[PDB]
Amino acid sequence: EDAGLVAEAEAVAAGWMLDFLCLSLCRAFRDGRSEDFRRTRNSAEAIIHGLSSLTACQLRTIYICQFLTRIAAGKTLDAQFENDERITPLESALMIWGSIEKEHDKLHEEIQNLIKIQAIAVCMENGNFKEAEEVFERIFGMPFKSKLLMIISQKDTFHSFFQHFSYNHMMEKIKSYVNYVLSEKSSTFLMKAAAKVVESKR
Template sequence: DEVSVCCPTDESTDKTVSFSRVSAVATEWMFDYFFVSLCRCFKERKRDEFNEMLSVFEVISENESLKGTTIHEKTLICALLVRVIDGKCLDELFDKDRSIMPLMSAAKVWLELKDTVSDESLFKSITNHLLIQSVAVCLEKGQTISATCSIEWFKKHVDIPRSLARNLSTIVQKKETYHSLFNNFSLNRLMETIQTFLDSYLKKHPSDYLLKAATKVAQSAPEIQSSEEAEPQDDTFSKSSRTSVQKKKRRKRNLLSTLTDVWTPEPVAEPFVCIRRLSKHELSQMTSPAKFAETSTAPMKRRKWTSKLDKFLEQGVRRHGVGKWAQILNDYDFEGRTSMMLKDRWRVLIKSHQVG
C-alpha cells in the first residue's frame, strides 16, 4: 500500500510514501477546489450552480483525513454562504428549532467565524446586517410576529446595538415593509459585504492549488474545447437540464454540522450546526418521527405564479434588465423559486403579451 514518489531534489532520490497520505493530500486539494468554487458561485449569484457544488462539497468534507482549524473554518464559511443565499426562503430549515430562520442561523455560524475576521468593524457590520435583513424578510412576507421574534432572538444570542433593536421594533410595529433602512441594508449589499470578508480570507488562506494546476494543463492543450464550447445549447437540452435541476432542488440537502469541533474524537452530546438544509424527514427524526409518518405521504402541491409574483418579476426587470435573474431574485421574495424559474416565467409573460 505504498507509492513511489520522485522528490524534486538535485540527487533525484526516490522516496516512498503511503497511499493514504497521498490520498489525504489529493482530498484536501479537492476540498479546496470546491470551497473556492462555492465562493465564486456566491460572488456571481449563481444559486443553482452553488447548490450543485454544495452536495459534492458535503461528501468530500466528511472524509476523515480532513482535519485542522482551516478545514473547519472553510466548512463553516460554506455554511454561512448557503444560509445567506437562502435568506429569503423562510421554509428552508438548517436547525431542528423550526423558529430559527436562515439568516438567524447564518448569525449563529458567523459568531463561530469571529476569530477569522481581522477587521472588527466588518464583523459588526455583517452581524447587524444579518439582523436587519432577517427582520426585513419577515415583514416582506407579512410575518410581523416572526419579525419581532427575530429581534428578540438576536438580542438574546448576539451582541447588537440596543438603538438598532429599538429602531427595528418600531419599524415592525408600524409595519413599514419598505423602510429606508431595509433599502440601505439590502440582501444584495449583505452579500457584497460578505464578499469583502471572503476576498480577505482567500488572500490569507490560498485555496487554488488545484485550479492553478488545471489552468496549466488547459493552457498546454488549447485544442481541447470546454463542454460549453463543444456542445450546442439546444432547447431540448436546456429544458431537460432545467427539469433535472428543479427535481434536485425539491430535495432538501444537509451540509455539515459543526457548532462543536467535528474532529474531536470524543462523542459530543451538544447539537450540531447544520451547513446543509434539513429535509422534513431529517427534522422529524430529530423531533417527532411518529408525527412525520402521518404526514410524509401527502403529495406536495405545485405552487402557481400569482399576480403579485408577476409584478415583482416585472419590477425587477425594469430595475436590473432582462437576464439579471439572480439580482432580481435577491430583491424580492419569490417563495423559493430559482433564477432559472424566473427566466422561464418571463418568457411565458412575453409570449402571452402580459408584459411589453
C-alpha cells in the same frame, strides 16, 4: 500494498478537493450562479462527510462554506432546517460568522449588523411578521431596539432604515469579504494545476 500510505494519499486528495470546492462555491456565490452554487455545495458537503479530522485551516474553510450556504437560503422558507435548527437561516449564519476564527474588522461588524437587520426584514418581506418579532426577540434580548420593534409592529417593510441595511448591501459586503477568501485560495493545488492544463491547451 500499504493501506496506510493509500489512506494518507486519500486524505491529502480530500484536502485538495475541499479547497478546490470552497473556491468554486465562493466564485458561484460571487457570480450569482445558484445552480452551480447548489451543485458545488452538494459536492463539498459530500467530501467533508468523508473527512473525520480537520486542521485549523480546514475548519475555517468548511465554516465559510456553511456561512455562504445559509446566506444563500436567507429568503427561503426552509421547514426542516427550522425543524432542527428552530432558527432562520440568517440567524444561523450570524452564529457562524461570530464563531469563525476571523479578524473582527470593520467589515465583520458591518456584515454582522446587516445580517441581523435582514434576518428580520426577510420575514417581513415574506409576510411573516410574527416571525420577524420572534427573530427580533432572539437577536435583541442601543436606542434603535425600540425603533426596530416599532417598524415590525407597523409592518413598515420599506422604512429608510431597511434601505440603508438592505439585502443588496448585505450581499455586496459579504461578496467583498468572499473576494479576499477567493484571492487567498486562488493558489490552491487543484485549481492551480487545473488552470495550468487549460493554459497549456490553447
